[PDB]
Amino acid sequence: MYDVVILAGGLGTRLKSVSGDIPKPMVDISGKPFLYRLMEYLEDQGVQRIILSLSYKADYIIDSLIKDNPVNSKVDFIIENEPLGTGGAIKNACKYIEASKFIVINGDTYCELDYKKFIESSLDSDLQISGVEVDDVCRYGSLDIDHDFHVNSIVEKGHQGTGIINSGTYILSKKIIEDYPHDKFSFELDFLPKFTGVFKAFVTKAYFIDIGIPEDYYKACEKFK
Numbered sequence: 001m002y003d004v005v006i007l008a009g010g011l012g013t014r015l016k017s018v019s020g021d022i023p024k025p026m027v028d029i030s031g032k033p034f035l036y037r038l039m040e041y042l043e044d045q046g047v048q049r050i051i052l053s054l055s056y057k058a059d060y061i062i063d064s065l066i067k068d069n070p071v072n073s074k075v076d077f078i079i080e081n082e083p084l085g086t087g088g089a090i091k092n093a094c095k096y097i098e099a100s101k102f103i104v105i106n107g108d109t110y111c112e113l114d115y116k117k118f119i120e121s122s123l124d125s126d127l128q129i130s131g132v133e134v135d136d137v138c139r140y141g142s143l144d145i146d147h148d149f150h151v152n153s154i155v156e157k158g159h160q161g162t163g164i165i166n167s168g169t170y171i172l173s174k175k176i177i178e179d180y181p182h183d184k185f186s187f188e189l190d191f192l193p194k195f196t197g198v199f200k201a202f203v204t205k206a207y208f209i210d211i212g213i214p215e216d217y218y219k220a221c222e223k224f225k
Contacts, residue, residue, distance in 0.1 A: 001046045002119065002171065005093045008035065008107035009055025009080050016214060023057045024211055025107040026064065030224035034211055035061070036070035037224065038110055043071040045115045051096055052107075053089045055080040087180065087187035094178045104187075106168035110220065112207040113169065122171040126197040130169040132208045137163025139213050149201045154188050164203055 006025075013020040025035040039050060050073050054061055058079040065075065076096065084092055090104055101122070103115070113130055122128035129151060131143045142163045144153045154166055166188075176197060177187075185191060192199075209216035 001048060001115070002099065002102045003049045003051060003097050004042055004047050004103045004105060005051045005053060005090065005097075006035075006038070006105050006107045007053050007086060007089055008061065009053055009058075009089060010083055010086060011056075011106070011108050011212075013056070015212065015217070023061060026061060027211060027217070029220050032070070032224070033064065034110070034220070035107060036068070037220075038105075038107070039071045039073070039075075041110070041112065042115075043073050045113075047073050047115070049074040049076070051076045051078060051093055053078045053080060053093055055083060055089075082184070084184050085186045085190070087177065087185040087191045088183055090172075090187055091177050091180050091183070091185075094174045097174055100175065101171060101173050104170045104172065108211045109168055110207075110209045110211070111167050111169060113167075113204065114206070118169075118202050119171065121200075121202040124198070125171075125200050126173040126176050127195065127199045128171045129199070129201050130167040130206075131164040131201040131203045132167055133162075133164055133203060133205045134208075135162060136160065137165055139215070140210065141166040143201055145201050145203075149203060151199045151201050154192060164201065165208060167208060 008025045011024045026033045029037055062077055138160045141157045142155045143151055143166050144155050145151050209220050211217055
C-alpha cells in the first residue's frame with residue numbers, strides 16, 4: 001500500500017457562484033469536516049502514511065488535526081507558501097516519498113474506491129487515473145479513453161449523458177514528475193498533454209462525491225447522518 005498525498009491547496013473557497021472562507025476540505029459533513037471523513041476511509045483501506053499538501057489556511061487545518069486526529073495513519077504536513085498548482089504540489093511532495101510510486105487524491109473529492117485493486121491495475125503503467133462510471137456525467141469533468149482504457153484526453157465538464165468521471169485520483173511513478181522543469185504548473189492542463197508514457201484508467205462504479213457540487217454536498221450530509 002502506497003503513501004497518499006492529499007491536495008488541499010488551490011481548491012478555492014466557493015460553492016458555485018458563492019464565495020466562502022472555509023477551506024473546502026474543512027466543510028462540515030454531519031458533525032465532521034469533509035477531510036476527516038476522507039482520511040477515515042483511507043485508514044479503513046489500509047493507508048499507513050498521509051501527506052497533506054496545504055496552501056490556503058494551512059494552520060487552521062493543522063490546528064484542527066492536532067485537536068482531533070480522526071486517524072492513526074502517519075500524517076505529514078507540507079505548507080505551500082505560494083500557489084504551486086496541482087502539478088507543482090505533486091512535484092514538491094515527491095521529496096518525501098521514498099518508494100518509486102505513490103497515490104494522489106484531491107481533497108474536495110470523496111470516493112469509496114477499492115485501493116488494493118487500483119494499485120494492482122497500475123502495475124503495468126507509470127500513470128493510472130481512477131474513473132467512475134455514471135449515467136449522467138453532466139456536472140463532472142470526464143475521461144475520453146479507448147478500448148484498452150488508454151487515456152486519450154481529460155474532458156471538461158458540460159457534456160451530458162453516460163460517461164466516466166475524472167475523479168482526480170492517480171497512482172504515479174515519481175520519476176515522471178520529480179524533475180519537471182517548472183515548479184509551478186497544473187497537472188491536468190500542463191503536465192498531462194506533454195506526458196508520453198503509459199497512461200491508463202482504472203474504471204469502477206464506486207460511490208463518488210465532489211463537494212464543490214451543491215447536489216453532492218447535500219448528498220454527503222444526508223449519507224453521513
